[PDB]
């Protein structure tokens, strides 16, 4: 019974960690896209 409770808590914690890490990964993906576009357009503006 204690193992059931502990592993349910572990699964919930892992799900929350997955959600937080997915949010962080999406933020970093968007940041990388924006940064790459910034570099490309900065090179473009200098021609």
């Amino acid at each position: 019974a204690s193992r059931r409770r502990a592993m349910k808590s572990a699964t919930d914690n892992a799900d929350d960690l997955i959600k937080a890490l997915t949010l962080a990964a999406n933020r970093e993906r968007q940041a990388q896209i924006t940064q790459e576009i910034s570099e490309i357009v900065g090179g473009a503006n200098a021609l």
Partner: protein, 506 residues
């Protein structure tokens, strides 16, 4: 006022020959040529060719189609008068051609039946017909769970060295049986467009097709990495032009593009060298339009237009299995279905490494023969249940009997879907193979021996009980009499099957 009138007269004043005012990195600017049209084919003094992609009031920005170093400032540029066009005909079967239709295999010249512009519009909505006949790839995974119907666009998307070119070459090879019959309604033609591949890899693909006998109905449009960005950009449209000539004449065509990721890179290079504004990942604003215009040529024409079809198999190479990148997103949205080939599955022994699951074919059942649809219907759900239960492989002893049965069934269906390279299976053999698994006849075989048991039973049926295969091919469905005969043959064979561990099967 009169100044404006004089300017109007001067502008309305305008062979036409221009002059190269600027050249470099595969792009040449051509002063003059007032009557040049966008994407017109320009010819330069050394026999070099270019495509007038930009037309400003000052100069024509033309991408040079290979042999670029011969261009100098002041060279006289002459216009061909016609937009990009390629020869097309039956003479291109068994030939290797650069994107302009000029052979590079070293054999004789190609007898062109006609010339097709690379930018002819795709069939309209009313000129098309529902994709309703299969294109048997010979890959059990694809033909059983992500079927490709004639007129469909199936994107083989995956990381490097994952089995994409292998899947496409197997698809091309599997059409040999349909070719030999001689019926144009079954006879499927193939065009393998290699973009940016090293020359020896194109040669190896040619060797694989020729040893497998496919080259008598397959054309290779080769734009190796050496060739200029212009060729790597035009090769898909050359292949599509050849396929379209075959398609509008009533023939069925399979177009493989390998890889569209390298066409996008070539177009990006051309556009950036042309000072076009870049977007995400430095791509020009019309890369999605590029690939859409490429793939929407693939279609199944209504019977009013001969009933021909062109099936696309665009290959795209992801990086770190990131299917959210720009080109992967564009092609996924464009195409009708996706075979996601993953390296993790490839290393685990799944071959071809298709992630059944995320991989999907929107045409679906309409692209499967009745036999496969009936036998392979339960395969997807069984594999889903197995992938959900795989975490219990350690504690199976505590599982319910039904859950254990599902786990054992899935562990054998996954083996059943494994398939060696360059060994496509005719549709009837696939039907029998999926019958072996979905009906539980593999439940008595060791998981280590499902592959060999399948192969040996298929060989046995081919050699001794060929009636089942003939029935499936002629009727397209597995009749109850044939089903009973197949079950009897399975049981007879299982008595004479030597398992790897020495066990016995009943």
């Amino acid at each position: 006022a009169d100044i404006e009138g004089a300017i109007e007269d001067y502008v309305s004043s305008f062979e036409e020959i221009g002059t190269v005012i600027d050249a470099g990195d595969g792009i040449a600017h051509v002063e003059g040529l007032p009557s040049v049209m966008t994407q017109e084919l320009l010819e330069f003094p050394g026999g070099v060719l270019g495509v007038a992609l930009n037309l400003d009031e000052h100069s024509v920005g033309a991408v040079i189609l290979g042999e670029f170093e011969k261009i100098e400032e002041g060279q006289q540029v002459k216009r061909t008068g016609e937009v990009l066009s390629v020869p097309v005909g039956d003479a291109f079967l068994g030939r290797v051609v650069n994107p302009l239709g000029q052979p590079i295999d070293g054999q004789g010249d190609i007898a062109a039946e006609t010339r097709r512009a690379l930018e002819l519009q795709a069939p309209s909505v009313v000129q098309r017909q529902s994709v309703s006949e299969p294109l048997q790839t010979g890959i059990k995974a694809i033909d059983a769970m992500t079927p490709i119907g004639r007129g469909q666009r199936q994107l083989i998307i995956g990381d490097r060295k994952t089995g994409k070119t292998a899947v496409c070459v197997d698809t091309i090879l599997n059409q040999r049986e349909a070719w030999l019959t001689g019926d144009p309604k079954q006879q499927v033609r193939c065009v393998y467009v290699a973009i940016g591949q090293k020359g020896t890899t194109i040669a190896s693909v040619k060797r694989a097709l020729e040893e497998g006998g496919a080259m008598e109905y397959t054309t290779i449009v080769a734009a190796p990495a050496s060739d200029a960005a212009g060729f790597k950009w035009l090769a898909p449209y050359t292949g599509s032009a050849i396929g379209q000539h075959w398609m509008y004449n009533g023939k069925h065509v399979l177009i493989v593009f390998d890889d569209l990721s390298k066409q996008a890179d070539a177009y990006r290079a051309i556009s950036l060298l042309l000072r076009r504004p870049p977007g995400r990942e430095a791509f020009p604003g019309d890369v999605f339009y590029l690939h859409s215009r490429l793939l929407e040529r693939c279609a199944k024409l209504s019977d009013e237009l001969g009933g021909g079809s062109m099936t696309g198999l665009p290959i795209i190479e992801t990086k770190a299995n990131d299917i959210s990148a720009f080109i992967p997103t564009n092609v996924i949205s464009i195409t009708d279905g996706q075979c996601f080939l993953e390296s993790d599955l490839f290393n685990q022994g799944v071959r071809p490494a298709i992630n059944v699951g995320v991989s999907v074919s929107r045409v679906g059942g309409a692209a499967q023969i009745k036999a496969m649809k009936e036998v392979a219907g339960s395969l997807r759900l069984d594999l889903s249940q197995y992938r959900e239960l795989e975490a219990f492989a350690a504690f199976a002893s505590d599982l319910d009997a039904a859950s254990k049965a599902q786990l054992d069934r899935g562990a054998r269906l996954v083996e059943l879907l494994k398939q060696p390279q360059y060994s496509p299976l005719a549709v009837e053999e696939q039907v029998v193979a999926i019958f072996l698994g979905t009906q539980g006849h593999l439940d008595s075989v060791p998981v280590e021996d499902v592959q060999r048991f399948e192969s040996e039973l298929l060989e046995h049926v081919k050699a001794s009980h060929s009636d089942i295969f003939d029935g499936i091919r002629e009727t397209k469905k597995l009749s109850e009499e044939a089903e009973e005969k197949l079950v009897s043959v399975i049981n007879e064979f299982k008595k004479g099957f030597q398992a790897s561990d020495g066990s016995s099967v009943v």
